[PDB]
């Protein structure tokens, strides 16, 4: 199945000319923050597209794909490989601009069986396989389904939640300290529209279930969170069930030998602590790994950062938010990563349906905004007011001044006391410098690692201290567009054709150009070299069957296509 040397030779023999090497080229970072690189990528990818890509038209039926007019027909030879054309005599990654060279034929590997083009593997078959997988497994209740659907589809999500999650950056010493404000804000947001909040970050709902899991919240939101967690656990259990146990090669055992969601070499799209990188480098240790963190190769992890010395401008420095209880140590356990991968790659796409995006934050602009508190002095031997109608309350007009935090909270229409707002000063202990990008690369797994596939290499990008926005709206003039966030999406799945309006210097030409092809910078990964590819994105954005069935079909599609994983699946 992996003797493609002769076929590649024969393809290179014949003369073929082609241009538009956008989705096949990978670059590196020039140590800018995110924005100069984003603008440069915008201008380049605008003026460097001579023709249209051939991997984007996946709407064709089987008849059209078979018809001899199909240009990409001659390259569909092996079901486990992808034959494309790329500029030859170049090394990946390389410079920022692709040097001019003669185009040659290159062939990557289809790691996932779901990467097969939709014209060959239809959507109805995937949905039927998913409903065959989910025979009697755990399902979700229509109440929770409707609630999370409304939360995902709502455009009135207050930016105060994004700001709070950003300043928390996923740390227990922050969560447990701000627990007083969080329960109040959650209950207030819920008892206005019957909607559950804080579904962006994975490291929020487990904290909710573990801490506020005794009756602080009403019996409904805790039940919704428990249902979501139970669905994730049932998915993981199914991954365990549908493979044979009792064998493991030099690398990982049957589990990540068969699937990807249980693989440590794979990383989540959002990183908050550096334990995943430790797990990644310590898991494989055989396939030659490489990490690019904004320039120099190799990351430098350090403990918590004080308030005085923050150094918003830095290079090759990653935080871990100290420790809740000298070398670095992993924060959480190993299955935490598996749960995060399952969540982010199944439940978020199945509900957002290609509407969510991922963006970066600006702490240099966020922190000066949150240091405006106008909580009033309480008289001695007196009680604090609870309702905001009296002037003593922080949410009163007597204490409402422009460009403060109380105006933010009033625009959000919430009710908070004083100690919760005061806890922000203790939150100011730990800090967040900036969000950054990571480009990891490794050889194929030992299941399909032969004498020629080792030369092939996979490339995927990820964000550190990033953000996931559900539904961006450019019709909110209460806050300037791009005041704290800027889109930097790197995925065929998490792409956002509309969130780009928040980026500075956007034209109608760029808008309609990005409306067709998903904008991904080359220094963050190419489509033909990444793991998740366009077929799965098209499937998740065009399939309309259900939510449970969609999740199970995506799970079934997330499977390897190696001659070893086949020994598990066929058995």
């Amino acid at each position: 199945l992996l003797d493609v040397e002769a076929t590649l030779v024969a393809l290179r023999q014949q003369h073929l000319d082609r241009q538009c090497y956008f989705g096949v080229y990978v670059a590196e970072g020039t140590e800018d923050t995110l924005d100069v690189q984003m603008g440069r990528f915008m201008e380049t990818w605008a003026d460097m597209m001579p023709h249209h890509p051939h991997w984007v038209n996946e709407h064709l039926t089987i008849l059209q794909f078979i018809a001899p007019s199909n240009p990409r027909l001659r390259f569909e030879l092996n079901p486990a490989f992808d034959f494309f054309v790329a500029p030859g005599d170049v090394d990946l990654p390389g410079p920022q601009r692709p040097p001019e060279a003669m185009p040659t034929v290159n062939a990557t590997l289809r790691i996932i069986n779901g990467n097969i083009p939709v014209p060959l593997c239809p959507i109805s078959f995937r949905d039927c396989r998913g409903t065959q997988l989910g025979l009697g497994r755990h399902t979700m209740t229509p109440a929770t389904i409707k609630a999370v659907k409304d939360t995902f589809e709502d455009r009135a999500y207050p930016t105060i939640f994004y700001m709070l999650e950003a300043v928390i950056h996923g740390n227990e010493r922050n969560f447990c300290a701000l627990l007083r404000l969080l329960t109040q804000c959650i209950r207030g947001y819920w008892e206005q529209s019957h909607r559950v909040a804080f579904v962006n970050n994975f490291h929020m709902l487990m904290y909710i279930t573990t801490y506020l899991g005794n009756g602080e919240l009403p019996e409904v939101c805790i039940n919704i969170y428990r249902d979501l967690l139970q669905h994730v656990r049932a998915l993981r259990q199914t991954i365990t069930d549908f493979t044979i146990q009792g064998e493991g090669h030099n690398g990982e055992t049957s589990e990540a030998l068969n699937n990807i969601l249980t693989d440590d070499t794979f990383i989540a799209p959002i990183l908050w602590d550096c334990d995943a990188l430790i797990y990644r480098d310590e898991a494989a240790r055989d396939r030659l790994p490489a990490i690019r963190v904004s320039g120099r190769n190799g990351y430098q992890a350090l403990h918590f950062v004080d308030m005085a010395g923050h150094n918003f401008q830095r290079r090759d420095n990653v935080l871990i938010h100290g420790r809740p209880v000298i070398p670095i140590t992993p924060h959480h356990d190993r299955e935490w990563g598996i749960l995060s991968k399952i969540y982010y790659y199944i439940v978020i796409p199945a509900f957002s349906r290609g509407s969510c995006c991922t963006m970066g934050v600006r702490y240099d602009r966020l922190y000066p905004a949150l240091q405006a508190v106008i909580v009033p002095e309480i008289p001695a031997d007196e009680e604090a007011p609870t309702t905001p109608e009296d002037p003593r309350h922080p949410l009163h007009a007597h204490q409402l001044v422009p460009n403060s935090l109380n105006v933010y909270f009033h625009n959000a229409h919430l009710t908070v006391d004083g100690d919760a707002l005061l806890t922000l000063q203790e939150l100011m202990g730990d800090m967040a410098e900036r969000t950054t990008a990571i480009l990891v690369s490794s050889a194929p797994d030992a299941g399909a690692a032969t004498a020629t596939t080792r030369n092939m290499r996979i490339y995927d990008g990820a964000l550190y201290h990033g953000l996931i926005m559900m539904a961006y709206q450019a019709y909110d003039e209460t806050i300037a567009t791009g005041t704290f966030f800027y889109p930097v999406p790197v995925n065929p799945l998490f792409a956002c054709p509309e969130h780009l309006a928040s980026l500075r210097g956007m034209t109608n030409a760029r808008r309609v150009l990005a409306k067709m092809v998903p904008p991904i910078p080359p220094f963050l990964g190419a489509n033909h070299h990444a793991t998740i590819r366009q077929p799965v994105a098209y499937h998740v954005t065009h399939s309309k069957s259900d939510f449970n069935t969609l999740t199970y079909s995506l799970l079934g599609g997330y499977f390897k296509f190696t001659p070893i994983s086949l020994t598990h699946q066929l058995r």
């Binding site: 009033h410 625009n411 209460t478």
Partner: protein, 101 residues
């Protein structure tokens, strides 16, 4: 004085002195008989508009009196700040009561 019978009499100069409720009472009690001999050859509807800007000025006086207890209003939109470089700027939803004390 403001006598709408002779169209040369009513003008915004005098309506400012008149209160807000009294002109409504004034117009109601006046008779329909209007002397056709006096009349604005200047598009009498301008006197109608003159009556509008006069009523707007009378309403402006009543608000200034009411503004004794109201709260000063601010900008309801962003991007309006002298030095936005220090910190960002947000609007304000006018969902309060002007009652102070």
């Amino acid at each position: 004085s403001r006598v709408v019978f002779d169209p040369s009499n009513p003008t915004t100069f005098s309506v400012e002195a008149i209160a807000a409720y009294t002109p409504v009472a004034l117009i109601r009690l006046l008779n329909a008989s209007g002397p056709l001999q006096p009349g604005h050859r200047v598009d009498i509807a301008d006197a109608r508009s003159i009556y509008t800007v006069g009523a707007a000025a009378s309403a402006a006086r009543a608000r200034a009196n009411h503004n004794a207890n109201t709260i000063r209003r601010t900008a309801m939109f962003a991007e309006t700040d002298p030095m936005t470089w220090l910190r960002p700027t947000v609007g304000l939803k006018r969902t309060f009561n002007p009652r102070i004390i």
